[PDB]
């Protein structure tokens, strides 16, 4: 479908342009597992970067 | 001519079919500024999609 579901393992507060903020337990849709450690994700009506080491595929 | 020249502002690694991979500083010929955020570009003998927010008209 739109991508894979991952669960945020930790809280993350966006620090730079187009990063998502999320909390531990948030389900994030990962649209792309881009190289470079930041994945294109979507949460709560925002698309943006998610640090790949913060999420677990569920 | 063949289109406008743009400079890549950031590295982009192609994630899907027919996207261009490029590096910051690449000069890309934009053949068409298609609606939907991805433009028809050309770089290094490949034609493909370029994310429009990654390039600056030069």
């Amino acid at each position: 479908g739109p991508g894979i579901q991952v669960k945020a393992l930790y809280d993350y507060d966006a620090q730079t342009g187009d990063e998502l903020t999320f909390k531990e337990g948030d389900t994030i849709i990962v649209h792309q597992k881009d190289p470079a450690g930041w994945w294109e994700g979507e949460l709560n009506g925002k698309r943006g970067w998610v640090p790949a080491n913060y999420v677990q595929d569920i | 001519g063949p289109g406008i020249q743009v400079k890549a502002l950031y590295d982009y690694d192609a994630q899907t079919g027919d996207e261009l991979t490029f590096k910051e500083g690449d000069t890309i010929i934009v053949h068409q500024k298609d609606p939907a955020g991805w433009w028809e570009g050309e770089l290094n003998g490949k034609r493909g999609w370029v994310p429009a927010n990654y390039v600056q008209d030069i």
Partner: peptide
């Protein structure tokens, strides 16, 4: 109790392809 984020590319998210 969390890992450090990976180094950033300083770039915007690509527009939706979908």
């Amino acid at each position: 109790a969390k890992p450090v984020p990976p180094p950033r590319g300083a770039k915007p998210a690509p527009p939706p392809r979908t």
